[PDB]
Design a protein around this ligand. Structure first.
Ligand SMILES: CC(=O)N[C@H]1[C@H](O[C@@H]2[C@H](O[C@]3(C(=O)O)C[C@H](O)[C@@H](NC(C)=O)[C@H]([C@H](O)[C@H](O)CO)O3)[C@@H](O)[C@H](O[C@H]3[C@H](O)[C@@H](O)[C@H](O)O[C@@H]3CO)O[C@@H]2CO)O[C@H](CO)[C@H](O)[C@@H]1O[C@@H]1O[C@H](CO)[C@H](O)[C@H](O[C@]2(C(=O)O)C[C@H](O)[C@@H](NC(C)=O)[C@H]([C@H](O)[C@H](O)CO)O2)[C@H]1O
Ligand SMILES: [Zn+2]
Ligand SMILES: [Zn+2]
Ligand SMILES: [Zn+2]
Lengths: 183, 185, 184
């Protein structure tokens, strides 16, 4: 119960543009007041599988959203499928869907929901990953905490790029970050 | 009472003095994972010289430093830029009621990161990161973190913020950055 | 379980890049359950990579440091890092017994498979940038790859490279933090 994850296999678990077009590998490990997070993405099919910005000059970003309720349970409007998200058991998941994971949620005082008051940038973490592990193929992973509606907590990953890629498969190196835990 | 986390609390109440009294909120969380401290930092400037950057008007305003100085018990010294009043071990979203007296296990390791001396100075006591002003991807600024290089203390953690772009009316409030360092014990 | 496996934090050379004991690799691995929190820096003290001059030697642009492990997570003798002071922490030194088992500190084989003819995914790589002499205008890239070496059950390799034309620049670095998924 110290780690929530997607099993680190390559079986698609995520829907960006079409059903099960991607494998998000996300590992959240609770180190007390902070969650240590490790993320990568493999797009296996559909619109975002092979990037060609000569053909499609405006296809330059997409977003994967994890939406959680008050008990830290994943909501079905999330891009990541519910069947694929649970506490670790060996290299797999527990057979039983978890009921509570509030200790893994992003802190609401650190990262408040949208309101009429001033919005601060500290609810964002920026990182760069590399497509196909090539050092000349950067893309930005923007991670934002608790900025989605229709939920109590959220983690969203926005992937974007500024270079003009021609026939580049969207599968990434890994990135580590952390965030302040709710409890 | 959370003895594994020293922090500023996660509120936005100013706790730090860069150019003038309580002109900023340094949000800093140090979580002890044994021999390493996992650190998470961001900064919100609310007033004074570093609140609104305009390098067309002020071409020389390009950097500033926030210093955390610690005595032999890991207690924050009052000449630090960070205030002592809300730097403490965690209790919920606030702090423990009494000011802590020992935090040596959170201090940067003196063999990894020695104080200045006649011995060769090595770069491993620095960590560089980039954060983004206002969360905008075209507004980078560098955060340079240095361990145990200040005099007049047993330990130190200093944050130097700097930028190279000519920003015009850009508020200095940052995205968050995570790093770690080797603990003293 | 909560332990630290490390090189010790001293500056005594422990690593062989081009010639024997030409460098100090400072590496600290801390187990936080299913992830290992890693902290790394490098000091080259002698040999080919100590002082970089790309005006006189423009092709000297990269080098690799490898840690090879057996089925029990024990460091192999043919790694660039020496076995003598790679062990579990005790104060600012090591435990007096060389460790027998560290499978919990090894990179997860499903996340990061050994080389095979299956597709090689990029998720077994982490890129970072460190700075030579602590100077902000002297970046070098540290590319870390998991379980891509043969003749071992697990591996961590550090490739250091740079694109700037450095002139008489000493190769000693700032520190970088990353994590990886643990085997157990
Ligand atoms: C990478 C690059 O080209 N940077 C140059 C920048 O170019 C702009 C875009 O780069 C950014 C940006 O907007 O600033 C870089 C951000 O980090 C990115 N944000 C994130 C979250 O990753 C950001 C985003 O990717 C984009 O904005 C998208 O949102 O990009 C660059 O992408 C863009 O490139 C394309 C464009 O995409 C295309 O559309 C177009 O067709 O072609 C352009 C090419 O122009 O261009 C943007 C500019 O219009 O521009 C700035 C000035 O505006 C600089 O030139 C910058 O390069 C740097 O300049 C400084 C001096 O001014 C130094 O030379 C920097 O080199 C280093 C060095 O010395 O080696 C790098 C070191 O890592 C750094 N050290 C540390 C510790 O951080 C040092 C140090 O800062 C200085 O030495 C001071 O001590 O600087 C050099 O990178
Ligand atoms: Zn394909
Ligand atoms: Zn303001
Ligand atoms: Zn030297």
């Amino acid at each position: 119960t110290r780690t929530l994850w997607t099993t680190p296999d390559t079986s698609p678990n995520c829907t960006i543009a079409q059903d099960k077009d991607s494998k998000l590998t996300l590992v959240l490990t609770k180190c007390g007041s902070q969650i240590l997070a490790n993320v990568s993405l493999i797009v296996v099919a559909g619109k975002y599988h092979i990037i060609n910005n000569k053909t499609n000059p405006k296809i330059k970003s997409f977003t994967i959203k994890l939406l959680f309720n008050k008990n830290g349970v994943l909501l079905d409007n999330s891009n990541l499928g519910k069947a694929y998200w649970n506490f670790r058991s060996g290299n797999s998941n527990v057979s039983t869907a978890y009921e509570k994971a509030i200790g893994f949620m992003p802190n609401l005082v650190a990262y408040p929901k949208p309101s009429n008051s001033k919005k601060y940038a500290r609810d964002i973490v920026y990182g760069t990953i590399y497509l196909g592990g090539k050092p000349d193929q950067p893309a930005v992973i923007k991670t934002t905490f608790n900025q989605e509606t229709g939920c109590e907590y959220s983690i969203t990953f926005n992937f974007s790029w500024s270079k003009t890629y021609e026939n580049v498969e969207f599968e990434t190196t890994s990135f580590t970050f952390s965030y302040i835990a709710q409890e």
